[PDB]
Symmetry: C3
Subunit: 240 residues, 3 copies
């Protein structure tokens, strides 16, 4: 009894995703999904002769959903952290990263360091329930933290000037600044902290070992990096 | 109950090997075995105060044998793949590689790309039941695929002109072209895909963890890369 | 029941340490413990909202203590080896190293190789029950091996001239020669063999997987390498 076997038998892979996080997972205005981790999710399902079932979830509900067993694996640009390690397993990482700022191109110079950023006159905007929030709350003792529930729309807020910056994964900062010409990803090559992206798993060795092997291959074949770039340069809508 | 404990108690390590794959495993005309993975198998058995029992197997029978529990571990130049990951575990890899062609030196230019190779007038020869076959069947929609049961002899077939080329592990192509002066390993530095060599294991965490530790040391001590070379430059017979 | 869950519930982490091994673990004359692995042990306990309980142990008693389940993890400059792998698990390593000699500066030239060192007129001193002893017994067929129970005081013995040299971890040789001006760490850059430092764990996947994640982060954040140095340059007493 590994759910690897459950799945193989089933011919069905329940994959949890949020659909608010380009380029990993966006819910099209059709109602279907699209993104890197979705792409990758398909490939995984293919490799097990499983049909891809996509289960919607949200950062706030991720771990309730996990504990309720509402899915087999979570693929949605999920940052590895220990708070999560407490209940769930994690694949090997597929992306090294860390939090870095995105801001108005013009204003760039003013938001290079936490030091600058943690000032009373400053507003950081973040989406709720994930490492973005957790990281802001943990680090901003002086500035204001604005919580914007819809992550898709969140970056327009900066364009619109409703906030000064967001500190998110350097990859997302890279992407949004493509989609919002106004915005500028702040030293993404050199993020403020270190964290990884990996897929959230149940505590199931045999399954982890598989997912790892699968992912490890993809990585080393260059397929990972390849599809990664694809989805970055992909012609997304700007919000919805 | 890990078979680590079974083995330690026993003082006996059943190692499955094919004996058709120089330089990892060849069965001498004596009936004894020789090769890298054999060498390495001994070392493993030594490390557990176990006696080395060598179990013969064949690519076609590998996973039947595995499921029948006809052995403790398989050491035989075994390519990590997911089809296998479905039932069995794998050690950490001990070699990177990928499939590349071997052909008559003279004919080299004609077989540089899959593109060239997948032509109706072409015969690829492969040994049955393994990644070589699986890869050919997967990639040759136009050419003829000849299945030659004995992998030791298989390369003479090309020398003899019973086939145009074989696509195998770049390391084997490298070796055979040493042993069959006529044959020529095609851009081994740049193989058509990526795959690793590792040892096939049962789903036993404690045992994997041990094997890994062992192998990880060997690797990092330089013993791995050392013995590896040894067996490559070793003076093999040509077929039997 | 992973003891990860036992611990989280408990709010208590039993960490085994010897307190005889600067810079990883020394028992102060103030009574407390201090060292890198202690530091790191705290951090681990913090990360699980656990209180740090330190369990004393000794190399001779380490694996007895382990099998008796007298602790949750062992953090004490513990060399990964297979003899141990037989019963216990190990975290990912946090340090590469290998055995090298420490001796009177004056006498250095005489103890460069095992070759020199395994002479009938020579006395090697080692602390009992660990890789230092195991390595000496394994390698010194000709010389005399003196077993000194207290590892803190052991290096004075050489200063005092009760032995010619000790062969220990190049990091410890590096440290003692700072603390005993008389002594000199012999080509620490090039140790006689290879081994890693890691934390000894029970056979508990979920817990290993956590510890690893924790340690992996610490490593990659630079916190590992940072605190490491701290404790090396730290102003230790000389014995007690």
């Amino acid at each position: 009894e590994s759910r690897l076997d459950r799945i193989l038998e089933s011919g069905v892979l329940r994959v949890a995703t949020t659909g608010d996080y380009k380029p990993f997972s966006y819910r099209t205005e059709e109602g279907g999904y699209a993104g890197f981790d979705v792409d990758m999710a398909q490939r995984l399902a293919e490799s097990l002769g499983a049909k891809l079932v996509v289960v919607p979830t949200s950062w706030p509900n991720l771990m309730r959903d996990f504990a309720d067993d509402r899915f087999d694996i979570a693929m949605s640009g999920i940052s590895i952290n220990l708070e999560r390690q407490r209940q769930a397993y994690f694949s090997i990482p597929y992306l090294r990263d860390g939090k870095t700022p995105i801001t108005l191109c013009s204003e760039e110079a003013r938001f290079q360091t936490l030091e600058q950023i943690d000032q009373p006159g400053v507003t950081a905007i973040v989406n709720p329930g994930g490492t973005n929030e957790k990281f802001a709350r943990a680090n901003l003792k002086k500035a204001r933290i604005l919580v914007h529930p819809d992550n898709v729309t969140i970056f327009q807020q900066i364009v619109d000037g409703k906030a000064d910056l967001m500190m998110t994964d350097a990859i997302e900062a890279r992407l949004q600044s493509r989609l919002h010409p106004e915005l500028c990803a702040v030293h993404p090559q050199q993020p403020f902290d270190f964290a990884e992206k990996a897929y959230l798993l149940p505590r199931d060795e045999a399954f982890k070992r598989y997912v790892d092997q699968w992912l490890h291959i993809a990585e080393q074949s260059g397929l990972l990096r390849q599809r990664m770039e694809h989805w970055l340069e992909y012609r997304w809508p700007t919000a919805h």
